Design a protein around this nucleic acid. Structure first.
Ligand SMILES: [Mg+2]
Lengths: 63, 99, 132, 161, 120, 195, 122, 101
RNA sequence: CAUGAGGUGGCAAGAAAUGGGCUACAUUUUCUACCCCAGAAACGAUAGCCCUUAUGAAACUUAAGGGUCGAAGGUGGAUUUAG
């Protein structure tokens, strides 16, 4: 159980690193709001449901 | 309406491309029809049904060669073979009413 | 009972996926669209030919891969650049997959006057979501 | 007052070098001729060779199955007409001719059949698209065919040599 | 002719570049002639035989074997007004229509003679 | 048969350029992109669908190829093809007094191999009849010959020209119509006394 | 030969949903501000095409499943662009065109007076 | 290989009307007139009546391209109102969504 | 070697029972320009008939316009439905 959580955490942080690198800002100042804005700009999901939105937060909220 | 307005209307009809002499309501339909394309020879009318012949021929060719593995034709052939081995084969020429 | 394309809830033994598992009224809410082209807007025409091409492509992809596919296929009609982006199973040799992909691309580019490039996805089997 | 500059009519080569020839290549990039998924990623060299050979064989068999049935590629829908929609034919269109039919069967069981047809229908041998093709393709048989084409009639000397 | 083909094959063999990214893919797609020229214009392959507007609009050059007064000239003016406002046809279709009308008039000469008018 | 090869997850460093990975419109392949994107309809006790086999992410037109640095480089690389707009045409007054003739274009898009369109062959000639030799009798004659197509407020002429399947031919026909219109100012007849 | 200069152009993009159209408009305004064109953009009213179809095929008139067609409109107000600049912009837009939008180009060219307009002959 | 004869007859009538149409159009134009000599109308009627059927646009019936249904066919997509609804409920064609208001 | 397929015409005609939609059954209605500070005549839709018009090769009907005649009508009692 904990191994899968650690895998999800490392995948999340490497994805955050890659996003901060492709956007052009510092990864320390790359807050979660900027992450959500970048995901919404790169993945424009045009639906009506608020649960079917592309999210990339900490695994504490997904699991 | 006077002579000046009539001459202006005549000049406008000659410029835009109408008829100088006055016409009637029954002679304008043919003009407006020749000014357009008939419904029997337009874009989407004669090509209403797609040419299914070439598609059927391509499907049969892929079936004979063994490419488009259609299970419906396989089931039909299976049912035909079962009906033939049961005792009801396809009728041939010379068996039925006469013989 | 309005029996639609939704999966019936009976015994827990059908490995239903995620696509057609939802109700047909949750398309614009909890789903999406397989095909996408300009023919579905106001002021445009030639939608019958697009639908015929789409259904023919679906039948061809289902016939040429008797079990090699998982769910369906996403269509992207970008004017004159069709892309049959889908998935692939891990059961056959990569040579056969490359051969089939090349043959399909050549047939599309030489028949429908449109180049096609695929983007295969490595999945073990069908993307199952519920064992109901 | 108003200065109207000259016009610039560019084609595809300009925008090519302006857009595609500017973005650099990734460090650990893979050749785009194959695929991108890990199951089809070109790892070693033998896998890449096998994938390329399979792609070539698929293209060849596709061209074969397309040119096998010419009756399935005769409907042109696009008005601008893409030039990649004209299938190639291997059968002559006029069988009453002799030299033209032989040339169509050879270039535009090939060279020997054309020579036999020209000998049967009494056709003259030319110095272009004949002796050179027989000497290249068809090395005793090719040399004999070239000598026969040179000694059949008084054609060009440089081409025969 | 085979030497030129061999030379072209050797050139294509010595000047080949493997595809690295999608840029080369789209370059090959454009050079092969698959997509539309991107200067997307409704004039490629649609010049209508290069006929100008004086032959499309003005049809005065097609009134020779027809009178100037009577119902025949009225019908000619009507069909001229109809063809002049037809953006779906071209000059060839109008010429064919005029030729067919002339043939129909010449075939039924007694009808035109007895129609209380003289076909000039 | 079966194999196992590491994707781009272990190949991307820390300073890898994004447009160098996907320079073309990629449909986002989750097998190579190590971005843990998740979306769909979750449940009460569970997690939603991830990225493997996610057809919803494939349906969504992703714009990963529209990297801001790539946009900057494309904008800086296309500065040579851009000409120069003169300062005399910035104001609308001088731009309209020096260039009153306007020719609208029609360029639509299709979804098939054919690009034909009978509606894309019409030009809208919007010439403001206010910068010419419009006197009194000529202006009255032009107004009476036009009718309602010429607006008396903004003084903008609107003539729908679409009688040939070409645009340059439509422009030439519109120019010829304007020529015939202006010929009435210098060539009279004999019906002006009974006005 | 002198080049043609354009005045205005309305290259609007229509989409089924809203997110993809908003992202495309954002990309367009980014590409516009990264050049020095300074364009405007507003939100025209939307249209919804509706049609009613039968839910079954037999004697079931009391149940009808209607279907809509949601689409949006976002036009770009461009100003001060020559012929070459407009062609380059159209090329860059078409090189990043989605697979479910429309595009109509209405560019008006500038011209003083033609050859035969002052004192022509016939 | 075909399975139905009704769709075949319909498409054959459509093709024969597309082939034979300019003559009928000219005859219909020569018919409807104000004055015109009556002999021209008479010979036009004789020519249009001497030609057999299976070419008149009235004999054209708009049916589906897969099911051949004469009633309940939208001219936008040219098909029956059942297969289109099923494909729309499956989630294929964009825009065509269930009316939620 | 049909219960199959192609060509021409006919099939919506009336002793009689029955459901639904519309119309009105006068000063709440009808008409005239402004849709209610107005005036006037103590009311409307349909058999059938004649002419003509959009498409249709030719109206035995479902479309519309014009014209003398213009049929029970003068607010419904055995039972019911929705807001
Ligand atoms: Mg229900």
């Amino acid at each position: 159980t904990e191994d899968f959580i650690k895998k999800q955490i490392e995948e999340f942080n490497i994805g955050k690193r890659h996003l901060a690198n492709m956007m052009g800002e510092d990864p320390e100042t790359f807050t979660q709001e900027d992450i959500d804005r970048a995901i919404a700009y790169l993945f424009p999901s045009g639906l009506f449901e608020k649960r079917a939105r592309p999210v990339m937060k900490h695994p504490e909220q997904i699991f | 309406l006077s002579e000046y307005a009539f001459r202006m209307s005549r000049l406008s009809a000659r410029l835009f491309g109408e008829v100088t002499r006055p016409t009637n309501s029954k002679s304008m339909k043919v003009v407006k029809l020749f000014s357009e394309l008939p419904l029997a020879k337009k874009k989407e009318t004669y090509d209403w049904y797609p040419n299914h012949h070439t598609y059927a021929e391509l499907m049969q060719t892929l079936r004979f060669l063994g490419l488009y593995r259609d299970e419906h034709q396989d089931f039909m052939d299976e049912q035909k073979r079962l009906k033939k081995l049961r005792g009801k084969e396809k009728p041939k020429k010379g068996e039925g009413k006469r013989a | 009972k309005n029996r639609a394309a939704r999966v019936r809830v009976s015994k827990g033994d059908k490995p239903v996926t995620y696509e057609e598992a939802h109700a047909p009224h949750y398309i614009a809410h909890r789903k999406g669209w397989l095909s996408l082209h300009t023919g579905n807007l106001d002021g445009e025409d030639h939608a019958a030919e697009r639908t015929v091409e789409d259904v023919f492509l679906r039948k061809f992809m289902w016939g040429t891969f008797p079990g090699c596919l998982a769910d369906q296929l996403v269509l992207k009609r970008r004017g004159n650049q069709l892309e049959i982006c889908a998935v692939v199973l891990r059961q056959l040799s990569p040579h056969k997959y490359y051969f089939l992909v090349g043959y399909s691309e050549t047939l599309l580019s030489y028949f429908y006057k449109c180049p096609v490039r695929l983007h295969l996805q490595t999945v073990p089997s069908k993307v199952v979501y519920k064992y109901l | 007052e108003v200065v109207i500059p000259k016009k610039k009519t560019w084609d595809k080569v300009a925008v090519l070098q302006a857009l595609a020839s500017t973005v650099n290549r990734d460090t650990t990039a893979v050749p785009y001729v194959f695929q991108d998924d890990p199951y089809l990623m070109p790892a070693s060299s033998l896998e890449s060779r096998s994938f390329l050979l399979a792609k070539k064989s698929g293209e060849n068999v596709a061209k074969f199955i397309i040119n096998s049935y010419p009756k399935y590629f005769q409907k042109d829908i696009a008005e601008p007409h893409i030039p990649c929609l004209m299938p190639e034919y291997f059968e002559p269109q006029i069988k009453d001719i002799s030299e033209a039919a032989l040339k169509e069967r050879i270039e535009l069981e090939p060279s020997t059949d054309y020579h036999f047809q020209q000998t049967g229908q009494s056709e003259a041998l030319e110095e272009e698209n004949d002796e050179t093709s027989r000497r290249k393709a068809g090395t005793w048989r090719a040399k004999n065919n070239a000598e026969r084409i040179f000694s059949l009639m008084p054609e060009k000397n440089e081409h025969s040599y | 002719s085979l030497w030129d083909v061999e030379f072209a094959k050797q050139l294509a063999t010595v000047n080949e570049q493997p595809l690295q990214n999608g840029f080369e893919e789209l370059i090959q797609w454009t050079k092969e002639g698959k997509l539309w020229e991107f200067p997307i214009n409704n004039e490629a392959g649609f010049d209508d035989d290069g006929s100008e507007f004086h032959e499309h609009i003005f049809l005065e050059k097609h009134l020779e074997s027809f009178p100037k007064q009577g119902p025949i000239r009225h019908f000619m003016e009507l069909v001229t007004c109809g063809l002049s406002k037809n953006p779906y046809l071209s000059v060839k279709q109008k010429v064919e229509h005029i030729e067919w009308f002339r043939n129909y008039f010449n075939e039924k000469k007694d009808i035109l003679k007895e129609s209380n008018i003289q076909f000039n | 048969r079966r194999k196992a090869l590491p994707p781009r997850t272990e190949k991307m460093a820390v300073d890898q350029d994004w447009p160098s990975v996907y320079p073309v419109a990629a449909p986002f392949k989750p097998s190579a992109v190590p971005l843990p994107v998740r979306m769909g309809y979750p449940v009460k006790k569970g997690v939603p669908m991830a990225k493997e086999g996610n057809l919803e992410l494939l349906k969504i037109p992703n714009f990963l190829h529209l990297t801001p640095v790539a946009i900057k480089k494309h904008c800086e690389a296309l500065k040579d093809f851009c000409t120069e707009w003169p300062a005399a045409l910035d104001s609308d007054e001088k731009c309209e007094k020096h260039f009153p003739i306007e020719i609208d274009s029609t360029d639509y898009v299709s979804s098939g191999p054919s690009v034909r369109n009978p509606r894309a062959r019409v030009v809208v000639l919007r010439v403001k009849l206010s910068s010419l030799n419009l006197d009194d009798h000529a202006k009255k004659k032009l107004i009476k010959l036009v009718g309602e197509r010429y607006c008396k407020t903004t003084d903008v002429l609107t003539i729908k020209t679409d009688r040939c399947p070409l645009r340059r031919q439509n422009y030439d026909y519109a120019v010829y119509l304007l020529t015939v219109l202006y010929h009435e100012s210098w060539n009279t007849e004999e019906w002006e006394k009974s006005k | 030969e002198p080049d043609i200069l354009y005045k205005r152009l309305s290259v609007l993009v229509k989409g089924h949903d809203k997110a993809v159209l908003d992202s495309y408009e954002y990309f367009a305004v980014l590409a516009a501000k990264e050049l020095g064109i300074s364009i405007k953009v507003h939100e025209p009213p939307r249209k919804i095409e509706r049609f009613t179809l039968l839910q079954s095929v037999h004697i079931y008139k009391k149940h009808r499943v209607q279907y809509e067609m949601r689409t949006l409109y976002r036009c770009l107000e461009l100003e001060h662009l020559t012929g070459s600049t407009a062609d380059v912009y159209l090329e860059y837009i078409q090189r990043n065109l989605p697979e479910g939008v429309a595009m109509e180009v209405t560019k008006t060219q500038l011209e003083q007076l033609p050859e035969h307009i002052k004192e022509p002959i016939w | 290989h075909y399975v139905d004869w009704r769709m075949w007859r319909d498409v054959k009538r459509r093709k024969m009307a597309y082939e034979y149409a300019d003559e009928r159009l000219r005859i219909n134009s020569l018919r409807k007139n104000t004055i015109l000599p009556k002999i021209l109308q008479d010979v036009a009627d004789e020519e249009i009546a001497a030609l057999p059927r299976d070419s008149c646009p009235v004999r054209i019936r708009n049916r589906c391209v897969m099911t051949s249904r004469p009633r309940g066919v939208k001219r936008r997509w040219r098909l029956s109102r059942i297969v289109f609804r099923h494909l729309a409920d499956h989630g294929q064609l964009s825009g065509i969504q269930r009316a939620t208001w």
